[PDB]
Amino acid sequence: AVVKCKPTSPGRRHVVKVVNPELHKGKPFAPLLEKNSKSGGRNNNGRITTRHIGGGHKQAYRIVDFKRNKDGIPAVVERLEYDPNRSANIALVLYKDGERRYILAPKGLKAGDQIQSGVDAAIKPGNTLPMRNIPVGSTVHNVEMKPGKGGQLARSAGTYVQIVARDGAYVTLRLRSGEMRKVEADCRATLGEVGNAEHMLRVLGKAGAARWRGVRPTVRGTAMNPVDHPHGGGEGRNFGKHPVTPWGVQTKGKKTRSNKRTDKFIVRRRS
Amino acid sequence: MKRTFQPSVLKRNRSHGFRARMATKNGRQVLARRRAKGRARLTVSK
Amino acid sequence: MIREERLLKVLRAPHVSEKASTAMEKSNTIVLKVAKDATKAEIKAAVQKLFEVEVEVVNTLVVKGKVKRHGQRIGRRSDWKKAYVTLKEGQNL
RNA sequence: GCUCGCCGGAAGACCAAGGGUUCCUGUCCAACGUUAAUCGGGGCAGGGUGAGUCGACCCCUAAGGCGAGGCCGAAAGGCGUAGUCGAUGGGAAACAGGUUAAUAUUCCUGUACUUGGUGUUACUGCGAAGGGGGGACGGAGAAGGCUAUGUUGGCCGGGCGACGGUUGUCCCGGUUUAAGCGUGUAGGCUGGUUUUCCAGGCAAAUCCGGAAAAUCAAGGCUGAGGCGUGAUGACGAGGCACUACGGUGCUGAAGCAACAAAUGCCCUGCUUCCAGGAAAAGCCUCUAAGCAUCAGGUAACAUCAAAUCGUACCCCAAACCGACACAGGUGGUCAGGUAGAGAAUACCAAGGCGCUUGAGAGAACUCGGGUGAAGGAACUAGGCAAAAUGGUGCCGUAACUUCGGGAGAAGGCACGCUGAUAUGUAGGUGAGGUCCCUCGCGGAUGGAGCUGAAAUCAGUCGAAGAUACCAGCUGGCUGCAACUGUUUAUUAAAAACACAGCACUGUGCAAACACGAAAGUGGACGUAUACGGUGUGACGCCUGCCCGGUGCCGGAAGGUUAAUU
RNA sequence: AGGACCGAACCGACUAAUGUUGAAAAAUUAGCGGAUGACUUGUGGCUGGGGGUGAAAGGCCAAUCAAACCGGGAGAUAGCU
Ligand SMILES: [Mg+2]
Ligand SMILES: [Mg+2]
Ligand SMILES: [Mg+2]
Ligand SMILES: [Mg+2]
Ligand SMILES: [Mg+2]
Ligand SMILES: [Mg+2]
Ligand SMILES: [Mg+2]
Ligand SMILES: [Mg+2]
Ligand SMILES: [Mg+2]
Ligand SMILES: [Mg+2]
Ligand SMILES: [Mg+2]
Ligand SMILES: [Mg+2]
Ligand SMILES: [Mg+2]
Ligand SMILES: [Mg+2]
Ligand SMILES: [Mg+2]
Ligand SMILES: [Mg+2]
Ligand SMILES: [Mg+2]
Ligand SMILES: [Mg+2]
Ligand SMILES: [Mg+2]
Ligand SMILES: [Mg+2]
Ligand SMILES: [Mg+2]
Ligand SMILES: [Mg+2]
Ligand SMILES: [Mg+2]
Ligand SMILES: [Mg+2]
Ligand SMILES: [Mg+2]
Ligand SMILES: [Mg+2]
Ligand SMILES: [Mg+2]
Ligand SMILES: [Mg+2]
Ligand SMILES: [Mg+2]
Ligand SMILES: [Mg+2]
Ligand SMILES: [Mg+2]
Ligand SMILES: [Mg+2]
Ligand SMILES: [Mg+2]
Ligand SMILES: [Mg+2]
């Protein structure tokens, strides 16, 4: 899929485009399509709460079924679609009752492959079972943190969570970050890994590509004035200060997690 | 040379009109002061 | 329908100019100054009852008041309404 | 009134925005007008804006706003649900001519159309706030079919020339016609149809989705333009009588074909690409309750309604924004001829203008230009400025390189006109005719006519043929930044900023973090191939040593150590 | 195909001159750069003052910016003129 572009102009020399020809080239499924208005990284107060977010291409939000609650009915992969909202590729599946739902396409779940959810489902890529019914060590993705809430772990691209162990009510999970988290065994998880693992091998190649994705230029704090950033500026390239955020908090090393409400679940922190 | 004032009736009324003034406590204080002073035109309203 | 009270107020006065006479003689249209709030249907009923003439169509235009002066102060004339009432074949003044 | 000059992708013509009577008429010239003014966007008076179909209003939603309750907050308030507003977007319908001093798709003439309402008759399953479909959508690109439009001929009317010639192979003008309705073509999409049957679309559904048979594939949908009608009309070059000399009436010929051709239409197409490309209603359809005589529905038909508001005029400007009748700024619409790749540019058309002080003179000097003996950067901070290069085809083109470049490198040759090839060719366009034919917007053939490069050969004129305008100067070595971008609006466009890439670090989701006394919101409807912060800044080769200090991370024995007691 | 190339519109603003009681409180004229894009543009919307927004210049936030403007405390205080 990784395909380098010939250097016919500056801006195309370094672009490394990942091309998957299985992806449906037509329009996406309309009944499961909503609107995704852009915010520019601004809140209900109009203030920029997150910097470097603005512009981009218009995107229609595809409603993805992260719960996988249609147990008992098999589904058939119809087309591996393209999702502009997520790193992975969605997959339109048709159930044996005539209902179409979008799911995060696993590694090699091509068209025609039959998927099933529920406790009765087989141990296959794309099948969703509760982690109590999944063998220890089985690589999964779209792991729910609460039963019935919907998957919220290992949903990016080529991401998966190995089931480290099973200790009754809870199951130890090795997340992509390297952290071992205890999640209830009732939570559902889809067998396999997320597809489109070549996503990391793409190279934007030019500043336009970043703007296409809706990322505005990042100004370094050292290039600003003392009033604009704690890094401020001196005569010439002057630093002489411990790296801090635009708000003064130490940036290189300082930990910031402060929950105490979820610490019990965490077994080991990512090294 | 483009100047600062670009007349737009819709925007003028939506920002300095009577209903915009009456929509807030501060805007009503503006009308009260203008009523107290005796301004013939209380707002830019039409 | 429209009370005769209403019909007796919608028509303010006949309009005298040069275009009005030309229209009155060529298009059989009597231009009449009407009330600002007089609608076309109101004007039709009024013309047919207070002039005994069958009317075909009424065209209404609102004439804005020209801002005159008194030589020292700026004043504005009030807006009036002009009604082009086309009589089918009735004759009048 | 005659010349003259200027603009003509404008300096013309329509608007939106904004303005607000500046419109047109009569009248006045104090002030306003950078001069005079008889004139004016000035004064004064009078007149002028006519709509079921254009626009608004209206129905529908976007960003967003307000927001019953609600949640939260000393108060004032904040946020947000049900809702309800909000266009810059979606949603019914009219065109040609004629007309006023001043409006016209609005008045008039001719011919249309839409959506409601009520009534008649025939007939009937009707019914949402629900369900489905549809509306409904990206960038670029490549065609072909076309039209607007232009050109040429033909045709019709006129003409026969202030100076040699001009009854023709001459000259000038005209040669225009719509909505609608009818047909349904180039093109585009799609198999069709029936039946049975079910975890879906919250319930239901004949609808949609699915599943399975059966049989047929030619039916459907959509679609420019053309033709027909509209149109026995309108309009029309231009005449003839009378003239408030402005006119006014009245009459009125041809009205065809060929070729060329859009950036417009078919095209919301089609092909391809990744950055993956509104919503809602109108609209079509399906059912949930009553009821099944009703009511509703449907088709035709008759009659009724379509209100209100805008409509003048300016609108790249003397009417808007700039204090000015200011050399500035201001979105959209149309897009003639010749030459040209062209919406460049030159010159013209339609149209509009000569910029509201003029008359002289022809000093220095200033400004804006033309030319220049010999020299040729000696000038100067610096070739600043100027001069020079400049088109097309073709031949030819180095180092270096990331194999794309460099490169239009450099350099050089041809170029006008005329004749022949070939009374205009190759190519394109295609009539008639002829045959076919499921007899049509059809097919085959065939070629009239029309248009039309380039090239070659020969000749010819000039000092010069890319002859004007228009239109790279080139090469060499080196610093910095990889590159396209960005910035100190109004002295700094850069080596600065950003940038793809790289790295460190944080962050397990009720994420970090950010704005918020809070609720809440962005991050993100994302989930560690993710996001935040920081540094560096493509690519290649790489990135050494030091943790004593400061910071951070980890660890806690023990010392110290607050409230509390 | 391309933040590809030349070049009008369009968007900018590198140089020169002019102008500097200007035609203009930033323009004109001859050149100049980009010109399918990280483009430009119409309408509406949104963020508010130690706040915003900033491809970062202390830039910009109505000819105003190392803390806008308006009103107020206010006749602040001036060993200074
Ligand atoms: Mg500094
Ligand atoms: Mg410095
Ligand atoms: Mg230094
Ligand atoms: Mg600095
Ligand atoms: Mg007056
Ligand atoms: Mg006059
Ligand atoms: Mg509404
Ligand atoms: Mg393409
Ligand atoms: Mg003679
Ligand atoms: Mg014919
Ligand atoms: Mg175009
Ligand atoms: Mg009306
Ligand atoms: Mg006008
Ligand atoms: Mg002027
Ligand atoms: Mg002006
Ligand atoms: Mg100009
Ligand atoms: Mg030109
Ligand atoms: Mg002049
Ligand atoms: Mg010389
Ligand atoms: Mg040069
Ligand atoms: Mg260096
Ligand atoms: Mg650079
Ligand atoms: Mg600057
Ligand atoms: Mg500058
Ligand atoms: Mg740097
Ligand atoms: Mg550097
Ligand atoms: Mg080291
Ligand atoms: Mg150039
Ligand atoms: Mg210029
Ligand atoms: Mg040049
Ligand atoms: Mg705006
Ligand atoms: Mg302040
Ligand atoms: Mg103050
Ligand atoms: Mg004082």
Numbering used by the authors:
A (entry chain K): 2 to 272
B (entry chain k): 1 to 46
C (entry chain b): 1 to 93
The paper states:
The ribosome was identified as the molecular target based on resistant mutant sequencing, and a cryo-EM structure revealed that myxovalargin binds within and completely occludes the exit tunnel, consistent with a mode of action to arrest translation during a late stage of translation initiation. To visualize the interactions of myxovalargins with the ribosome, we determined cryo-EM structures of MyxA in complex with the vacant E. coli 50S subunit at 2.10 Å as well as a MyxB-stalled ribosome complex (MyxB-SRC), at 2.96 Å. In both cases, additional density was observed within the NPET that could be unambiguously assigned to MyxA and MyxB, respectively.
Indeed, in the MyxB-SRC, we observed the simultaneous presence of P-site tRNA and MyxB but no ribosomes with additional presence of A-site tRNA. However, careful examination of the MyxB-SRC revealed that while the acceptor arm of the P-site tRNA has accommodated on the large subunit, the terminal CCA-end is not fully accommodated at the PTC. Indeed, the density for the P-site tRNA in the MyxB-SRC is consistent with an initiator fMet-tRNA; however, the CCA-end of the P-site tRNA is flexible, and thus, there is little to no density observed for the fMet moiety. Even if the fMet-tRNA were able to fully accommodate at the P-site, the IB and D-Val1 moieties of MyxB encroach on the A-site and would prevent accommodation of most, if not all, aminoacyl-tRNAs at the PTC. We note here that the only difference between MyxA and MyxB is the addition of two methyl groups on the IB moiety of MyxA, which we would predict occlude the A-site even further. Our toeprinting assays and structure of the MyxB-SRC lead us to propose a model for the mechanism of action of myxovalargins, namely, that they trap ribosomes during a late stage of translation initiation by preventing full accommodation of the initiator tRNA at the peptidyl-transferase center on the large ribosomal subunit.
